[PDB]
Scaffold this motif. Structure first.
Motif, short mmCIF file in Angstrom:
data_model
loop_
_atom_site.label_atom_id
_atom_site.label_comp_id
_atom_site.label_asym_id
_atom_site.label_seq_id
_atom_site.Cartn_x
_atom_site.Cartn_y
_atom_site.Cartn_z
N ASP A 16 77.86 74.72 -11.28
CA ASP A 16 78.14 75.82 -12.22
C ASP A 16 78.83 75.41 -13.54
OD1 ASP A 16 78.38 78.28 -13.43
OD2 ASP A 16 79.87 79.06 -12.00
N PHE A 17 78.00 74.81 -14.34
CA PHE A 17 78.39 74.39 -15.70
C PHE A 17 78.89 75.53 -16.56
CE2 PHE A 17 78.20 71.28 -19.13
CZ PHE A 17 78.11 72.09 -20.21
N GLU A 18 78.16 76.63 -16.60
CA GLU A 18 78.49 77.74 -17.52
C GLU A 18 79.83 78.37 -17.14
OE1 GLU A 18 76.91 78.98 -20.35
OE2 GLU A 18 75.04 77.73 -20.21
N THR A 98 69.07 64.55 -13.53
CA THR A 98 70.13 65.05 -14.37
C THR A 98 70.34 64.13 -15.55
OG1 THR A 98 72.53 65.75 -14.24
CG2 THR A 98 71.95 63.87 -12.98
N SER A 99 70.95 64.68 -16.62
CA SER A 99 71.22 63.95 -17.89
C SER A 99 72.68 63.74 -18.12
CB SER A 99 70.62 64.66 -19.09
OG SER A 99 69.25 64.92 -18.88
N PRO A 100 73.07 62.63 -18.71
CA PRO A 100 74.46 62.49 -19.14
C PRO A 100 74.65 63.19 -20.50
CG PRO A 100 73.25 60.53 -19.79
CD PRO A 100 72.27 61.41 -19.05
N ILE A 142 62.76 71.74 -10.81
CA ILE A 142 63.52 72.99 -10.83
C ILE A 142 64.71 72.80 -11.79
CG2 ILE A 142 64.89 74.55 -9.42
CD1 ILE A 142 63.24 73.63 -6.99
N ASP A 143 64.72 73.50 -12.91
CA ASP A 143 65.62 73.22 -14.01
C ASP A 143 65.82 74.52 -14.83
OD1 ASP A 143 66.51 72.21 -16.67
OD2 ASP A 143 65.95 70.18 -16.00
N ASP A 144 67.04 74.78 -15.27
CA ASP A 144 67.36 75.96 -16.08
C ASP A 144 67.02 75.93 -17.53
OD1 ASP A 144 69.61 74.18 -16.11
OD2 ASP A 144 70.67 75.67 -17.25
N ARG A 145 66.62 74.79 -18.05
CA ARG A 145 66.31 74.63 -19.48
C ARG A 145 64.89 75.11 -19.78
NH1 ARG A 145 67.84 69.27 -22.80
NH2 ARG A 145 66.89 69.78 -24.80
N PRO A 146 64.68 76.07 -20.67
CA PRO A 146 63.30 76.55 -20.88
C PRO A 146 62.30 75.57 -21.42
CG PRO A 146 64.85 78.23 -21.48
CD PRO A 146 65.68 76.93 -21.31
O1 LIG Z 1 75.31 73.38 -23.26
C1 LIG Z 1 75.08 72.46 -22.46
C2 LIG Z 1 75.51 71.15 -22.72
C3 LIG Z 1 75.25 70.13 -21.83
N1 LIG Z 1 74.57 70.41 -20.68
C4 LIG Z 1 74.23 69.31 -19.76
C5 LIG Z 1 75.41 68.60 -19.11
C6 LIG Z 1 75.05 67.16 -19.00
C7 LIG Z 1 73.99 66.88 -20.02
C8 LIG Z 1 73.36 68.19 -20.40
O2 LIG Z 1 72.07 68.00 -19.79
C9 LIG Z 1 71.09 68.94 -20.18
P1 LIG Z 1 69.51 68.53 -19.35
O3 LIG Z 1 68.96 67.24 -20.01
O4 LIG Z 1 68.67 69.73 -19.61
O5 LIG Z 1 69.83 68.27 -17.86
C10 LIG Z 1 74.16 71.73 -20.43
O6 LIG Z 1 73.58 71.93 -19.34
N2 LIG Z 1 74.41 72.75 -21.31
#
Ligand SMILES: O=c1ccn([C@@H]2CCC[C@H]2OCP(=O)(O)O)c(=O)[nH]1
Ligand SMILES: [Mg+2]
Length: 195
Positions: A16-18, A98-100, A142-146
């Motif tokens: 839960d990042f947000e 996942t991404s750094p 499965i990823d939240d980024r559109p």
């Molecule tokens: O606003 C943000 C800023 C960063 N992040 C993620 C936390 C680690 C790196 C970034 O990855 C986004 P991804 O490449 O979509 O997984 C977010 O998910 N939202």
């Protein structure tokens, strides 16, 4: 026969990042305006805070660049239990993809530590840390980024959009689909991609 391969995002899907962000932002910057989760729009938190007041993008970034930010994120409801079940299924291989963040002092370490904490040491071998998910081959992501792009113009995976505050109102182009939460029927989505 061939195993189904599933890539699962971490921030916004397992972790839960947000909510973690908002709580630590409010604690550190009680003086400053903030964005309630029901009002989040657009993938990047910092871009929305950056419209809200000058300087606030940099304050936002400083929350996730801080030591222990990633490690102390809470799991989303049902995420740990679902991914454990998924990894145990016959003919199914699960990777965490996942991404750094750009500032790399704590984030990669803490993401490994977080996976060890919730899935155990044996699950560490299932982690793929990359800024480009298009070069990772699988049946599903499965990823939240559109909008997920990168060096590969035709990724092998189908992207299933995981619902988050920032994406919940978005109309997608058919035939794109969603997983609404871990309570939603993820097994049906996997089953639809099997031989
Ligand atoms: O606003 C943000 C800023 C960063 N992040 C993620 C936390 C680690 C790196 C970034 O990855 C986004 P991804 O490449 O979509 O997984 C977010 O998910 N939202
Ligand atoms: Mg994410």
């Amino acid at each position: 026969g061939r195993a189904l391969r599933v890539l699962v995002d971490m921030d916004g899907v397992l972790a839960d990042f947000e909510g973690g962000f908002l709580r630590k932002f409010r604690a550190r910057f009680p003086d400053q305006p903030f964005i309630a989760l029901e009002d989040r729009r657009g993938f990047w938190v910092s871009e929305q805070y950056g419209r809200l007041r000058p300087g606030l993008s940099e304050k936002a970034i400083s929350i996730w660049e801080s030591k222990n930010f990633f490690f102390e994120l809470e799991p989303l409801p049902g995420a740990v239990e679902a991914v454990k079940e998924m990894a145990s299924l016959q003919n199914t291989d699960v990777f965490i993809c996942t991404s750094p963040i750009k500032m790399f002092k704590y984030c990669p370490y803490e993401k490994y530590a977080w996976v060890e904490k919730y899935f155990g040491p044996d699950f560490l071998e299932q982690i793929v840390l990359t800024r480009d998910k298009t070069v990772v081959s699988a049946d599903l992501l499965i990823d939240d980024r559109p909008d997920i792009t990168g060096a590969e113009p035709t990724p092998s995976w189908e992207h299933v959009l995981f619902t988050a505050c920032h994406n919940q109102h978005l109309q997608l182009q058919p035939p794109r689909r969603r997983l609404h939460s871990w309570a939603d029927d993820w097994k049906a989505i996997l089953d639809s991609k099997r031989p």
